[PDB]
Amino acid sequence: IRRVAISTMVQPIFSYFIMITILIHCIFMIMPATQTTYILELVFLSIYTIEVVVKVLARGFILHPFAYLRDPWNWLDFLVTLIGYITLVVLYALRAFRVLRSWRTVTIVPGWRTIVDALSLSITSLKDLVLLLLFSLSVFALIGLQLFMGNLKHKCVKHFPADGSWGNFTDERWFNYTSNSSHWYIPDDWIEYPLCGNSSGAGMCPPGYTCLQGYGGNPNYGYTSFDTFGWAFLSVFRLVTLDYWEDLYQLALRSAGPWHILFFIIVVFYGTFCFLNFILAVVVMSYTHMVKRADEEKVVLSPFFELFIAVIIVLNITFMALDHHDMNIEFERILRTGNYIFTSIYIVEAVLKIIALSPKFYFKDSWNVFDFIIVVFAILELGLVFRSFRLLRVFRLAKFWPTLNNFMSVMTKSYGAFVNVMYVMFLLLFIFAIIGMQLFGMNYIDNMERFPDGDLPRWNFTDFLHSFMIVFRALCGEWIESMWDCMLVGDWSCIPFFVAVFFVGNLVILNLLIALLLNNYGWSNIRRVCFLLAKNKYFQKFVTAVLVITSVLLALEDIYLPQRPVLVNITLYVDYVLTAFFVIEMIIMLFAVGFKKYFTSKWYWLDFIVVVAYLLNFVLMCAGIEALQTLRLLRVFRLFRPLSKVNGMQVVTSTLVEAVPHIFNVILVGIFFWLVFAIMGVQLFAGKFYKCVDENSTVLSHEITMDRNDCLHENYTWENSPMNFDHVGNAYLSLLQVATFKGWLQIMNDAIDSREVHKQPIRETNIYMYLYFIFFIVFGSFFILKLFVCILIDIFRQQRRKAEGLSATDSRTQLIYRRAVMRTMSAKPVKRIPKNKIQGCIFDLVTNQAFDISIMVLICLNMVTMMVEKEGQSQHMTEVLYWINVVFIILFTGECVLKLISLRHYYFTVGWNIFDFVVVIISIVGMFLADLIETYSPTLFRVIRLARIGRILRLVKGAKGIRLLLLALRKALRTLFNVSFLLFVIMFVYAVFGMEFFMHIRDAGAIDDVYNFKTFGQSIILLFQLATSAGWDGVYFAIANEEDCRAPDHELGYPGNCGSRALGIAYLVSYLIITCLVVINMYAAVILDYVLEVYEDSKEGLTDDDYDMFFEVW
Ligand SMILES: CN(C)[C@H]1C[C@@H](c2cccc(C(F)(F)F)c2)CC[C@@H]1Nc1cc(F)c(S(=O)(=O)Nc2ccncn2)cc1Cl
Ligand SMILES: CC(C)CCC[C@@H](C)[C@H]1CC[C@H]2[C@@H]3CC=C4C[C@@H](OC(=O)CCC(=O)O)CC[C@]4(C)[C@H]3CC[C@]12C
Ligand SMILES: *[C@@H]1O[C@H](CO)[C@@H](O)[C@H](O)[C@H]1NC(C)=O
Ligand SMILES: *[C@@H]1O[C@H](CO)[C@@H](O)[C@H](O)[C@H]1NC(C)=O
């Protein structure tokens, strides 16, 4: 018995058979359930029961160290088998989790130990981070509840009629009228009522309407609001994750006012640019430790011919990329004949190489066999669709391109880890897709009526394909809208599901892929006087002040400038003075530094271009020609000299300058892959996005209009989608939209409905086309776009090592010991004299730890009491809560006074004691000021009531891991501030240029009355939103429009209202490249470095806490 059990278990055939059974079960799970599936499930369950019995007989149940249930895998199998039998005997929410058994398949791919261990270590190490996450999220949720409570209920309500239609005015009649939903303003075809607010810069009502509060529900089926602590917490989490956050951002600013942007600036800065980087650093550290441990464990044959082949390949690539929709006969003739010529040339190539070189030698080389494969596909395709395979020819360019060759070599060197990570990703996606299908499949069908039009949405859990796709979307970073739909048709259980899918899929697996990439990819008197003036500090300070003042003056040129004659005159005279100032400065710099040195520098060249532009403007104005606004706007670029000289700024500029070439190379490689994918997409979807529409922009059913002829016969419009794959440029732009995850829903909606050309699209008639996008997203976003962060991390590490004076040849242990010595050098103790008998007793009581524990408990109680608050509460509840807060404040005051008396004047020898004292003063002052403010603006009262957060901020005191994280953040604060300042300068420059370019465009897309480029504040709001790439598709659609736009009339003075496609493309693409992919990532780099350091001080060395402990006994 025991012998038989052990012999059966040890044989690999047993494990192989179990694994094959698991794989067939997984395959059957995808297909819909039928009668045969029941018997198949029974057979699988019997097999699993045999396996469990054999293992338990071989080993034992728990009662010895090496029993059956001493292995987590055995535990998982046992629980799944028991759930199976429980469901066999008889809720239906437990049969969904049998798919967990599929996790075992991860063991097949060789090398899975490292990936699984890294995942486990990351999960274990997130313990210190989760608590800080919860605390920060709660604090931000409380702030948002205090700021935006009830603001999202604002609506435009029609004024009470004075004609007597509703009867004589009464309070009850007025309430009845205003409560009616038909009297609330809403534009036709809109789903959500627009928000309003009487604050300056907020949404304005149409004439005859008033902005009121407390009417109707909140946006997004009531799931978006700050009315209660839970909803505020959810909104703050959404903002931190940047999940469709621009919608909430715009709603908040439209309801409350532009100034509230400050709030969003904080949560984004601390939540996104810092904490998520802590998670990334933890994942990187885990993977680094595991990989380190694993490693420790242990004529024709002439250059001219090759150049000819390379040029032929490049001209074939351009011929291939020249394909587009609706080609004329001649263009197709040229492409066809060139294709024949290229194929003949390649056949000649193959025969010549086979003859000159021995066939064995020819087939020994990998590139030669690759070329032969290309030749055979070319012959097969010309003989007889095999056109797609022509794309293989493009890859032949890698042989003659050293950068691409090195990229491919690096990729193939470490394919195993990438394969393991991708397999883990797909297995997790499959498990969640199965679970979500089982949990929410029936909800969509049963409660379909709850949807706005009673129609099934595009994304749902009806079948396996849709569930897998929706989970993939959640992994990509978009989960809140799917969760909204699930709550609408489901219950609370959707929240934990989708939310979970976000943590594992996005914050761990993708971070693990980033860590993988990072590890693997990584006269004399005049001259003398002028020199003296030039190197004087006062002259430089004066120049910098003048430049800053002129930049601020530039910021005042808004849409309202023509209405202010005085401001116009100030600007004109300032420009006239600046021309002379620039000329004189150039002359002095020349006389000081010499022609060669002046013209050998890039900064002096920038100054020379600015001078030339201003002189050109001066001569144009003298001649009577209107000055070129861009040329005079060029002086903003002079601010970069003083910016680079800001203390602590050298490291950031050095990192960026050193990283420029690597960024350029990565951009070239991405352009190559995107060209390949764009050719594929053009071949797939060229000209298939046309559809038939009516007066109103709604697509007709294929039944009424079968094709183009019917559409034109019935006098309808045959319209093309703005985003399409008509030619290579449109394909590039669409792929850029897809990669950034902005506007991709519509793109793939059109793609999956695409049919033959000149045919009406049908809903989900080409579903499998999603595959084409999946691959791209895998290879375009998860790999190519993540090289920038790795490059920045490495270069910043090197530059920070350089700045501190450290040697590049030293090893990590040497640096750790050097830090330990430097810290050991500085240390001084101190003692406090105990207090007189009563004072000494009070001192002894206060010094006890139980006192601190009690204070912490009181802080927790007060924080909960703050959480109790909600929108629409009664006056009694509000007053009781305020009185409880007063009691808490008095208790804290008593504690502070007791500590002060006990410690006499030593209270101020500990920084946290000064913090407590300041918080006490602030609380006791703001508490009294609140009554006076409330008795005699609600926004001001809400803002000044923020002082309550100080007394709850004390909860961080006493922690160890949170203390370490805050230590790392404090060390990195200065570099973070410098990066933020650089980002602000870039945003200012882009704001002025955008305000110059797109100030008069007609309201469309994301541009409207509230959000536009009309003023500096609105432009800054839009650019802050765009710095994360959020909603840039709508901005592009608004600014790039060139249809139904009236041209400007110079004679009549009308400025025009028409956009510019090329200018908008350049603007937005350059901004996205500069900010999203380079400047933002810097944050991560900085964080990571500092974070890493502290841990290697805590684990492999000594920390300040160690010295404090040592001196405690001293
Ligand atoms: C409850 N009403 C009747 C009054 C009682 C007043 C009062 C009058 C006379 C005597 C006393 C006594 F006995 F206590 F001395 C107290 C003191 C204020 C209190 N109102 C209030 C209390 C708070 F806690 C907060 S708060 O939760 O926002 N806390 C904040 C706010 C801002 N800064 C930091 N903390 C806000 C407010 Cl309006
Ligand atoms: C140095 C770095 C790290 C921080 C930079 C400071 C910012 C927080 C400042 C700089 C410019 C400020 C903006 C200047 C102009 C405005 C317009 C202002 O709204 C108005 O114009 C009110 C009048 C109206 O709307 O009618 C709202 C605040 C805002 C966005 C300011 C908000 C705070 C900003 C972004
Ligand atoms: C709102 O006013 C319309 C117009 O008189 C009326 O038909 C409707 O019943 C009113 N709403 C309610 C809830 O009574
Ligand atoms: C308006 O008054 C009518 C009775 O005259 C009432 O039935 C209706 O509910 C009121 N509208 C509301 C409460 O929105």
Q: Single out the residue of 146, 130, 137 nearest to residue 238, CA to CA.
A: 137
* Pocket test residue of 199, 255, 261, 1010 for ligand 2, highest count of atoms within 8 A of CB: 261
Sequence-distant (≥ 6) Cβ neighbours of residue 944 within 8 angstroms:
926, 929, 930, 933
Q: Give the burial class of 303: count Cβ atoms within 10 A of its Cβ; 0-12 exposed, 13-18 middle, 19 or more buried.
A: exposed
Would you say residue 142 lies in a domain? no
Torsion of the alpha carbons at 548, 553, 558 and 564, rounded to the nearest 10? 170
Joined tokens for residue 931: 């009554």
Task: Please tell me the distance from the alpha carbon of residue 241 to that of residue 237, in angstroms, as a whole number.
Answer: 6
Task: Assess whether the C-beta atom of 179 lies below 6 angstroms from ligand 3.
Answer: no
Would you say residue 194 lies in a domain? no
DSSP codes joined into one string, 358-385: -HHHHHHSHHHHHHHHHHHHHHHHHH--
Task: Assess whether the C-beta atom of 165 lies below 6 angstroms from ligand 3.
Answer: no
Written as one letter, the residue type at 209 is: Y
Would you say residue 488 lies in a domain? yes
The answer on 660 and 629 residing in a single domain is no
Q: What is the resolution of this structure in A?
A: 2.9
> Cβ distance 249 to 1031 under 8 Å?
no
Task: Please tell me the distance from the alpha carbon of residue 125 to that of residue 283, in angstroms, as a whole number.
Answer: 9
The answer on 917 and 1030 residing in a single domain is no
Would you say residue 457 lies in a domain? yes
Written as one letter, the residue type at 697 is: S
The answer on 930 and 892 residing in a single domain is yes
* Residue 246 known to bind ligand: yes
Written as one letter, the residue type at 637 is: F
- Residue by residue, what is the 3-state secondary structure of 885-940? HHHHHHHHHHHHHHHHHHHCCHHHHCHHHHHHHHHHHHHHHHHHHHHHHHHCCHHH
Task: Please tell me the distance from the alpha carbon of residue 195 to that of residue 215, in angstroms, as a whole number.
Answer: 12
Joined tokens for residue 38: 């029941």
Task: Please tell me the distance from the alpha carbon of residue 195 to that of residue 16, in angstroms, as a whole number.
Answer: 62
Task: Please tell me the distance from the alpha carbon of residue 122 to that of residue 67, in angstroms, as a whole number.
Answer: 28
Q: What is the phi/psi pair of residue 692, to 5°?
A: -100, 125
Q: What 8-state DSSP symbol labels residue 536?
A: -
Task: Assess whether the C-beta atom of 835 lies below 6 angstroms from ligand 1.
Answer: no
Question: Which of 471, 498, 520 lies at the terminal end of a domain, its last residue?
Answer: 520
Closest ligand (CA of 158): 3
β-pairing, 717-719 with 155-158? unpaired
The answer on 744 and 602 residing in a single domain is no
Written as one letter, the residue type at 544 is: T
The answer on 572 and 713 residing in a single domain is no
Sequence-distant (≥ 6) Cβ neighbours of residue 864 within 8 angstroms:
none
The answer on 906 and 990 residing in a single domain is no
The answer on 564 and 507 residing in a single domain is no
Q: How many CA atoms lie within 13 A of 446 on its CB side?
A: 8
Joined tokens for residue 893: 């005051």
- Looking at residue 969, which CATH number applies to its domain? 1.10.287
Task: Assess whether the C-beta atom of 426 lies below 6 angstroms from ligand 1.
Answer: no
Strand partners, 910: none
Task: Assess whether the C-beta atom of 866 lies below 6 angstroms from ligand 1.
Answer: no
> Cβ distance 424 to 505 under 8 Å?
no
CA of 898 to the centre of ligand 1 (A): 22
Q: Single out the residue of 682, 704, 677 nearest to residue 692, CA to CA.
A: 704
The answer on 394 and 433 residing in a single domain is no
Would you say residue 943 lies in a domain? yes
* Residue 478 known to bind ligand: yes
Span between the terminal Cα atoms of the chain, in Å:
66
Q: What is the extent of the structural domain holding 918?
A: 837-957
> Cβ distance 766 to 751 under 8 Å?
yes
Please give the C-alpha separations between residue 1024 and each of 54, 269, 277, 986, 1027, in angstroms, as whole numbers.
Answer: 63, 12, 20, 11, 5
Task: Please tell me the distance from the alpha carbon of residue 1001 to that of residue 1013, in angstroms, as a whole number.
Answer: 9
Would you say residue 169 lies in a domain? no
The answer on 1109 and 983 residing in a single domain is yes
The answer on 1088 and 969 residing in a single domain is yes
β-pairing, 209-212 with 691-693? unpaired
Question: Which of 348, 379, 413 lies at the terminal end of a domain, its last residue?
Answer: 413
Q: What is the phi/psi pair of residue 210, to 5°?
A: -130, 140
The answer on 783 and 754 residing in a single domain is yes
How many structural domains is the chain composed of?
7
404 CA to centre of own chain:
28
Which 3 state secondary structure label does DSSP give 65? coil
Would you say residue 238 lies in a domain? no
CA of 928 to the centre of ligand 1 (A): 6
Question: Which of 615, 645, 675 lies at the terminal end of a domain, its last residue?
Answer: 645
- Looking at residue 13, which CATH number applies to its domain? 1.20.120.350
Task: Please tell me the distance from the alpha carbon of residue 592 to that of residue 610, in angstroms, as a whole number.
Answer: 19
Sign of the dihedral through C-alpha 1101, 1102, 1103, 1106: positive
Task: Assess whether the C-beta atom of 1017 lies below 6 angstroms from ligand 2.
Answer: yes
Task: Assess whether the C-beta atom of 908 lies below 6 angstroms from ligand 2.
Answer: no
The answer on 869 and 759 residing in a single domain is no
CA of 170 to the centre of ligand 4 (A): 14
Q: Whose CA is nearest to atom 1 of ligand 4?
A: 176
Would you say residue 198 lies in a domain? no
Q: Single out the residue of 556, 550, 551, 553 nearest to residue 1015, CA to CA.
A: 556
Q: Single out the residue of 1057, 1063, 962 nearest to residue 1001, CA to CA.
A: 1057
Task: Please tell me the distance from the alpha carbon of residue 259 to that of residue 438, in angstroms, as a whole number.
Answer: 46
Rounded (5°) CA angle 843-845-846:
65
Please give the C-alpha separations between residue 319 and each of 336, 340, 342, 345, 683, in angstroms, as whole numbers.
Answer: 10, 12, 10, 15, 14
* Residue 481 known to bind ligand: yes
Joined tokens for residue 718: 């045959």
Strand partners, 1049: 1054
* Pocket test residue of 177, 179, 182, 215 for ligand 3, highest count of atoms within 8 A of CB: 182
